């Protein structure tokens, strides 16, 4: 798994509760041989959501 963690905002650090609140989005990349396809066999589709 190729991992990237991007931080958008540091909301607060609550000293009383000792809690850090952050807004992030995780970048996760990996290989799945079962979901392997060629664009040429499907009309040039390079991406599927």
């Amino acid at each position: 798994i190729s991992l990237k963690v991007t931080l958008t905002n540091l909301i607060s650090l609550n000293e009383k509760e000792e809690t850090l609140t952050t807004s992030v989005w995780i970048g996760i990349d990996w290989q799945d041989y079962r979901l392997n396809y060629s664009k040429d066999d499907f009309g040039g589709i390079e991406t599927l959501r």
Partner: antibody, heavy 122, light 113 residues
Framework: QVQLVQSGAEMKKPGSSVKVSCKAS????????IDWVRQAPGQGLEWMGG????????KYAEKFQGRLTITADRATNTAYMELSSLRFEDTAIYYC???????????????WGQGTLVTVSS | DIVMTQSPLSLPVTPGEPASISCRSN???????????LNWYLQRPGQSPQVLIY???NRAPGVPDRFSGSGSGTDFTLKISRVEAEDVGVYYC?????????FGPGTKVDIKR
């Protein structure tokens, strides 16, 4: 069934401006998927301009740049062209060709209007 | 501009028999994603033009299954499996890759006698 209804025929003189409408019914059309194609008398079809999602702005042929304005209004399901500084050679039947769902970097024109004859004559 | 040419300039046809029209570009119309941006249009006499084939092989919705299209990067063909009397008019090929988009000179079809 989807119908495109264009404005009526227009009699114009040289130097004036003409505005042709193209209103749709029976379907839903958007900001893109509009292309205008004129056919001069006894001549073939000629692309004038259109709006594609790729440019997000109208693109015109070199013959019409500076004279042609193409707009599409999603809210009222209609599109317009405005050709200014009219010449005798601008006499033609002007068609609107539209697709409900636009192709990103090309155009097909599944739905055509009936065409409007604009005659520029002194 | 890309120059589109068609052959024949006139095709006398007979209802009940096959037919074929061809188009050629002076530049390759192949896209980076692997499809050819060549559309075919039919203008019947008195009517507005109608799209028949788009992107060189795909039949448009509502078009009869008789019309078929194919081609390569520079040469394209439109075929009618069985000509009908309603298929008469001027067929135009159009490149949709490079602005300004250009129509061909057109090929006229009429009943043979």
């Amino acid at each position: 069934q989807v119908q495109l209804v264009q404005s009526g025929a227009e009699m114009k003189k040289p130097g004036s401006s003409v505005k042709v409408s193209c209103k749709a019914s029976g379907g839903s059309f958007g900001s893109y998927g509009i292309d205008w194609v004129r056919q001069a008398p006894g001549q073939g079809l000629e692309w004038m301009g259109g709006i594609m999602p790729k440019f997000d702005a109208p693109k015109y042929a070199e013959k019409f740049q500076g004279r042609l304005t193409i707009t599409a209004d999603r809210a009222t399901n209609t599109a317009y062209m405005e050709l200014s500084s009219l010449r005798f050679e601008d006499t033609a039947i002007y068609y609107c060709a539209r697709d409900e769902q636009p192709f990103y970097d090309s155009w097909r024109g599944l739905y055509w209007g009936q065409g409007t004859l604009v005659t520029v004559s002194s | 501009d890309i120059v589109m040419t068609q052959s024949p300039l006139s095709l006398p046809v007979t209802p009940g028999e096959p037919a074929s029209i061809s188009c050629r570009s002076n530049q390759s119309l192949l896209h980076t994603k692997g499809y050819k941006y060549l559309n075919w249009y039919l203008q019947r006499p008195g009517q507005s033009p109608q799209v028949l084939i788009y992107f060189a092989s795909n039949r448009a919705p509502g078009v009869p299954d008789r019309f078929s299209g194919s081609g390569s990067g520079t040469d394209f063909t439109l075929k009618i499996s069985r000509v009908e009397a309603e298929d008469v008019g001027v067929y135009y090929c159009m490149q949709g890759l490079q602005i300004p988009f250009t129509f061909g000179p057109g090929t006229k079809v009429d009943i043979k006698r």
